[PDB]
Design a binder for this molecule. Structure first.
Ligand SMILES: [Cl-]
Ligand SMILES: [Cl-]
Ligand SMILES: [Cl-]
Ligand SMILES: [Cl-]
Ligand SMILES: [Cl-]
Ligand SMILES: [Cl-]
Ligand SMILES: [Cl-]
Ligand SMILES: [Cl-]
Lengths: 177, 173, 171, 171, 177, 173
């Protein structure tokens, strides 16, 4: 059974309103050692948002702006990239790499469950013991079509036929390992 | 509030990640589709997407052979997905912020459609109903600003603050 | 056909322009009317560059922030000068230009003359890359080898690699 | 002079090409010899695009990884097709093209004819932007206002904003 | 006295060799809850390097590579951006924003002192209480030249002269606040 | 090993962040400099840099007035600095990784010069001495690989591993 986002997420998740001051966000973040706060939907159809340590440092501290007057809505990401609780941990890694984020709320429908970060992955994913070759089932399926085509064209007992099924075999050994 | 589902393209073609890029292009030519949704292999598997830009930039721009390359080599999986109920203004903004042009519209595990920058341009109400993003947050923050002025100055001056509020609420309406 | 397919053979041939001074609203109006995802911005005079405004400019810079299209002008979101395409540019090179400049569409300009607009959509729907794939710079790979093959059959005898220039040639 | 300074007036006029099939080593050799930071890659024929290889291509893709320039070919690190510059393009528009495409140099091409190479260095050392600054798209700002000024003196009487089209004009 | 990088850095800094496996790096990182490891110079002239949580998640986990065979040198940044111990915390924020990193060794000459991150800034910088308007001394100096030029051109008792010194005054009030 | 200081441009002009962009351009024209170093205002203040690309992209490309814009508005401060002793191969690599083209060469608090991609192209020994980056790490990792093979297989087979090592050391030499 593939390890899931919900299994490694930080379960204690804290929200803040978009209208709050960056100072409020900072105080909350220091008090609980949080590197991301989820921004509270204002109603059922309103997306989730997120404000991160990197937003705060890059957009506020780096320009010497005053966090006591700046608001969260001015720095947050809303809507933000979200993670399904069932999403396998190799996919959460890939999402984060592709969208260039380090952190996302874990959301089931409209319901906030947690927050998942690069740190959650580093510290709690099974990627060292169980590295999952991405899309390996698509590779197997493609390689089986190649083998069938080659075998039907060149003969079911030809060396190229055998070599093409050996590509399938190797990919299949890896997946069930 | 205009929703993603009210402007999405409803007819949505799926393809497997194992299919050749040539198979993708053939289906896209046939129906004039600029994205195909990649279908989950099982219940925990995310949605994926393969677009015209993926094909042009990753295949055609190197002169690779589409008959031998596969969809899984150029798709985005997991992809950014859109909730059917998300305001179109927020769709525009998600797309800007993640630098994508199109996404499947998903409810639970179910594909409902695909939505693009083209759908927003052609069908959104952004010209006649410009939506100031986060204007409701500005309104709560101006209220909080007023209460700090009334407890510090006193219950008139405090009145100067409370007007700012009305000018924003007027603008929301 | 056996010749390299050119940009002018797959471009969208219909091209209305708009002025840089027009409102974004006018641009959207025109785009909706004729189903356009890019509009070419008209040079003010013979020496003024071509420009372009796209669906992405409008959606990312206007809609995404809630700006009023009726007050914004095209000049505020357009790209001018824009990347242009020569009519005779091989469709594979258009693909490559687009990936390296991170654009999706451009006008096809012949000297000072606007001829059409070519997009990633044109390439996807009308390119021959599926039946005639051809690795970019294969011709240069050859030149380089047919020259290494000069120096290898110069030093290590004319009797002993050359089929590389032969195989690459059929490809 | 009072006219907009053109790219051809500040370009570096001397232009040696190199073939895409040449080794990186040959390219560096030529670049060192004549103090060049960009080399134009020669079209293989009338329909083949211009290309360019730069000091940054060489330093980032070759030196930074320790690759052997004597074995790598220009085609492996060049940009082809490259962004090109029309000889008559206003020097401010060249600046802008460069920022929007994130390049620092390009060939100046007249039709199919190579005329020179223009760089951020040419702009910095030879542009008139210090004595003659001119906000990009000011001319469009005017057009837009001289038209708002039509509709404001159409609705709210010809007796009552227009000096905007006047002040902007001297600027 | 301006708060410095060395005052807010994580002092306990851990190094690893470039030749170590990504698995070794991961184990070290989990054991001490580290989000960056500094890569050990091989000799006195050899630059420092860094490998981060984000390198590991983006380059290893996201592609299902095997950390037990991959080496740190394949994913690290070497040389890396480094932070002088005396660098004011508003500048460390700005460096990180401009180079798009979240984490850097603190280095004095060739000597490693610590590691400083976006989290160190969020949790321990004085940016909420003392926001520092970047380059405010350059603005003051520029505004004083403007005032002098204007006053000499238009008269030392003209309204535009007074308005230009008022720009200086406002900037000066802020800096000593 | 060729060092940054052996290929840097030695003559280095500084400018204050308060200077106009026009003042920057005038000095750059006069000496043909594609960067100026911005000098620390005091002992804890970092080095900064302003380059030809900053000027062209941030000033000329908008048609802003260089006589009114100031250096502080377009400079990089703090900037990426280079140690005089850093191998040129590593300079190339720092520049690739941070996407810069030039940097001051600093020792302690002292400006020694400026080094660019041009200095590397013109004066580096990268053609005749290509430097495989991290080859010394590859060598330690292949040694560690050998010892794991000798304790698991036994002291010959283990011999297959130890050759890989020599082929890399040969290549370092
Ligand atoms: Cl973050
Ligand atoms: Cl975290
Ligand atoms: Cl797309
Ligand atoms: Cl577009
Ligand atoms: Cl360059
Ligand atoms: Cl990181
Ligand atoms: Cl940290
Ligand atoms: Cl530069």
């Amino acid at each position: 059974m593939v390890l899931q986002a919900q299994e490694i997420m930080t379960q204690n998740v804290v929200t803040i309103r978009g209208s709050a001051t960056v100072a409020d966000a900072v105080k909350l973040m220091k008090e609980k050692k949080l590197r991301g706060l989820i921004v509270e939907p204002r109603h059922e159809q309103d997306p989730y948002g997120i404000v991160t340590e990197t937003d705060i440092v890059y957009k506020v501290a780096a320009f010497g702006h005053d966090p006591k007057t700046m608001r969260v809505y001015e720095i947050m990401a809303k809507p933000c990239v979200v993670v399904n609780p069932e999403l396998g941990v190799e996919y959460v890694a890939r999402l984060f790499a592709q969208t260039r984020i380090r952190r996302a709320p874990v959301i089931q429908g409209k319901t906030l469950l947690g927050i998942i970060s690069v740190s959650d992955i580093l510290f709690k994913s099974d990627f060292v013991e169980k590295p999952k070759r991405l899309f390996i089932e698509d590779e197997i399926e493609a390689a089986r079509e190649d083998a069938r085509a080659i075998c039907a064209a060149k003969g079911e007992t030809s060396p190229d036929c055998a070599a093409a099924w050996d590509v399938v075999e190797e990919l299949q050994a890896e997946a069930s390992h």
